[PDB]
Design an enzyme around this catalytic site. Structure first.
Site, PDB file in Angstrom:
ATOM      1  CB  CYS A 135      -0.963   0.182   1.142  1.00  0.00           C
ATOM      2  SG  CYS A 135      -1.862  -1.343   1.813  1.00  0.00           S
ATOM      3  NE  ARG A 191      -5.014   2.108  -0.012  1.00  0.00           N
ATOM      4  CZ  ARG A 191      -5.187   1.891   1.389  1.00  0.00           C
ATOM      5  NH1 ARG A 191      -6.596   2.221   2.059  1.00  0.00           N
ATOM      6  NH2 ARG A 191      -4.337   1.136   1.926  1.00  0.00           N
ATOM      7  CG  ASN A 201      -0.917  -5.394   5.829  1.00  0.00           C
ATOM      8  OD1 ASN A 201      -0.574  -6.186   5.300  1.00  0.00           O
ATOM      9  ND2 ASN A 201      -1.638  -5.248   7.015  1.00  0.00           N
TER      10      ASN A 201
END
Lengths: 316, 316, 316, 316
Positions: B1, B17, B81
């Site tokens: 990510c 994102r 994450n």
């Protein structure tokens, strides 16, 4: 610039290229129908019955000046920038097929059906650059692909080099040989999850994915893009439908895209991936998106009176 | 990510994102109107009258579990994450505001109007992670941005860390401090044309654009991505209109996208950028494209009745 | 292997080379005095009055087989490994100077006084490899230097290439051209203290020295050693006395030394810098140290009845 | 600066360091006999009967200020530069053992016989830094090793950190944790011959040794050096005799030496490896060479009367 080719299971052509520069204007999806009469600059020959061709380009003097183009039998050609390397005669050679540098893309796609056929004819081609006093010479090398293989055409001071392009990728300078040798530095780069290992007592693990790929360069120089795209092309899983191969194409390219701010040219302006074009031989469709708009636009050849008689230039 | 924030010249938020993973979870664009009644799992307090919010996420037990989201007042948040580093208590702490890890994005978007406000309240927030048989804990860190600045929240075994994110970018492991130190390795990487220099008698010149950027890593590891996108975000020229800024956002996030075949995860599947989302406070619009379709879809808060009282999943 | 040349202020020759392999035995400082009679394998010619020569080598068949050697007028030649590239005819050519590959070093140092002189004669040289049925052919390229300049001799399938070596360094594969192009990737690497700079709001500074040099590779592959040694040679400050230039030499080399454990060869054995040899024309002295002993040993030519008649082979 | 520890198969200590700086301080080999009377500046306690010690350092006010040193019982310590991170109190803390930063090496060597002992006592040690008009504080971290293991001591603004150094190596900034995370980027770097693989149809092979080691940084930054020497130390084959182990030590430290011209410091001078020192507990001998002379000199504790009571600076 970057060109890419691969295939599916059914030997369809997927061929794609980035157009990288500070700015562009007036280029267009441009159809050269079978009915268009084409007068070759230095009386190079050609098929009695021309291939339909579609590509991205401009029309100068009612002739199609193609950045990249593809024919209805799955053959595609892109020209890419190569100054400092590209070097041409300015006079036709008697008893060769003399092809003006700017018509070369059109020529190859009007007249040939395969890389085999193109490669064979090149053995007797002269690639003439006609110098215009104000206008700077286009100094390119050419990526050509069909559903089986790609070749690279590098005409330089010492002559015409035609390479088998086993990695199915091309960029800019320096020579194809260099790029091929350079790849060897990266031969340990892997798409596998980094295997836990120990340096002395210290256990090393990967935080996550991408650690095995460490060593791949990430700058937008020609050699680095070559390596990065070669890796990505070679490791992308084979796909079997059109949607997925066009996705494959466009993700692969643009993995080496040039983003505003990254890298200035000689004139101090930022080089950007201004458009991405592709070709599918499964659907004889050309695709394209731009810097300002990532939505991929399709241009089916059958859309498209190919038995017609003039250049068509489609906008938006 | 990967997460990214920047502004224009009018103090508007541009925030977005990449969600990298092997498989989708069924996420959708997800509107949370001001009329939706929400009972915080650990009874965290809230604004008398909540902010409207839109985001990308999933509904589980009629609660919106946002991957990322933004409010009408220009504040945005993404979870990324962070396993190996993220570590939480499982029980509320008396006197603090106790916020469930999954509701944290909704909770911030609803109750705060700026990063100043959030940062201020985080001094009394406890981030609580619910154990669920026999799912794994979601172990994230958070990137929070408004028109002025970004922060990073890393709740770890030694406590809660709130960082000023001066590079306006966030990836995965390891810690934020690591990444910021790591950047210093690349401080000579330049977007300028590499100027001619000599090594001994050997004159070195650049082939063209990008040689000054040499040194930037090209792999899709978490740290390599942090460096590439930090670079890209810090060098991208300020833009002044919605379309140029959205284009800025998406190309910036594209510079660190994960392409099929590049990198396996621990289960042997390729990690890919499944979608890329964005937000503009200029227009209070959420944006999104996907691996399958790079066309960017917009979702303006205007087109929804934020006075309503039900969760709206908008399929695309 | 790595070779290096530079000069002082007074145009003295400093020339040096690493000998890199798994193991070595029997090589020796080896003097070929002016009084030794030398019968050239294919009746190549030579000066009526031979140069004294000193080098590192073995005597096979009462002939000096030199790894590297230097003459009393400041000219030095090293042969370095080049399989996969090096390719020789196995029969003498009528009306060329035919020089057996293994005598080449001796030949050039017996008979020439300058790189100018060597380069001139090479225009008419054939470099014959005599194949021995059991013995594998020595497949080298040659680094040759005097107090002004170095050249590189690469005899390959397509003929003999003689390069001006403007960086004054050589390694192993691939071709000199490749290495020269490759250097260009590193043209921004600096020995200056990394200038403080900002990425967005984030201020980047160097921890200390060496940050501007980031981007230089540190592995012991041939291309990486080429780059690392080229950098170090080109950035080392000019020295003006013998002690300091021999220091310069030996530090420069060995900046690309191969340490046990670093890197296995094709046969699984670790490649090591087994010895480092050098030559000073200021003192017509040869120097040497080994893997087992870094103490530099000197072998003054005047020590050394050069008017004598047989090979001398000095041990320890 | 760089520090290195390893053993042989008999539990003996091999320990050493590179001292990198622009100028010498007048350091010498420096023997501290058991009979020397030492009064710790802040009254830290001590062994009734101190260990003999030898090291490299300077005498200031008839006190031995060691850069590095070792005791007769196999314990060694080096101080390495750490500004930007090292931070100390200037006043003793009641109840702790308060040790002056400059006496810390002498203090450890004299009073402890193992890393276990030291680590144990560090739990009650305060490291105190004396302000001196108008010299700058010496801001170091320490590498401590015996026959079994190494630790790292980093006293910083947040407290004293004692790390198990599983890679047996230490450099400069930033923190030890940083470096250990950083290593994980290089976990695929291999001393094995890179095996043949294909990218698409392109077969990639290595030129020869070192391609698997591709990815290791070659610059002389602190972090780059930590990675290179960690690699080198962890891959070097275990050796079993004094001479091979000393050779191991010095080549290992040579892999990260600083050569004149590579890197300027903030004052504009080139940082260089001024000397490299080492220790063997097998022989209780200290070793050393210098920038000017790579010949390694030995200094056996045997050759000195450790029952004596005066500081012995041994000029070389």
């Amino acid at each position: 610039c970057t060109g890419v080719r691969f295939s599916d299971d059914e030997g369809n052509t997927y061929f794609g290229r980035n157009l990288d520069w500070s700015f562009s204007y007036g280029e267009t999806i441009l159809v050269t129908p079978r009915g268009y009469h084409y007068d070759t600059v230095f009386g190079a020959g050609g098929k009695a019955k021309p291939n339909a061709v579609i590509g991205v380009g401009v029309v100068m003097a009612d002739r199609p000046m193609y950045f990249d183009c593809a024919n209805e039998h799955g053959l595609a050609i892109a020209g890419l920038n190569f100054p400092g390397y590209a070097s041409f005669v300015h006079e036709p050679v008697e008893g060769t097929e003399n092809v003006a540098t700017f018509e070369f893309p059109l020529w190859v796609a009007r007249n040939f059906d395969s890389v085999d056929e193109v490669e064979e004819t090149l053995r007797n081609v002269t690639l003439v650059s006609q110098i215009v006093p104000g206008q700077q010479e286009s100094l390119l090398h050419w990526f050509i692909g069909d559903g089986k293989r790609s070749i690279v055409v590098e005409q330089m001071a010492d002559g015409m080099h035609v390479h088998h392009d086993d990695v199915d990728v091309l960029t800019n300078q320096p020579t194809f040989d260099f790029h091929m040798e350079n790849l060897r530095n990266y031969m340990c780069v892997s798409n596998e999850m980094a295997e836990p290992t120990s340096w002395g007592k210290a256990s090393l693990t990967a935080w996550g994915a991408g650690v095995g790929m460490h060593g791949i360069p990430g700058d937008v120089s020609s050699p680095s893009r070559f390596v990065r795209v070669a890796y990505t092309n070679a490791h992308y899983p084979q796909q079997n439908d059109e949607a997925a191969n066009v996705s494959r194409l466009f993700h692969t390219l643009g993995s080496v895209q040039m983003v505003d701010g990254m890298a200035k040219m000689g004139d101090g302006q930022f080089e950007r991936t201004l458009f991405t074009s592709g070709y599918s031989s499964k659907t004889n469709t050309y695709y394209m998106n731009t810097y300002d708009d990532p939505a991929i636009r399709s241009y089916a050849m059958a859309d498209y009176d190919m038995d017609s008689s003039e250049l068509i230039s489609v906008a938006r």
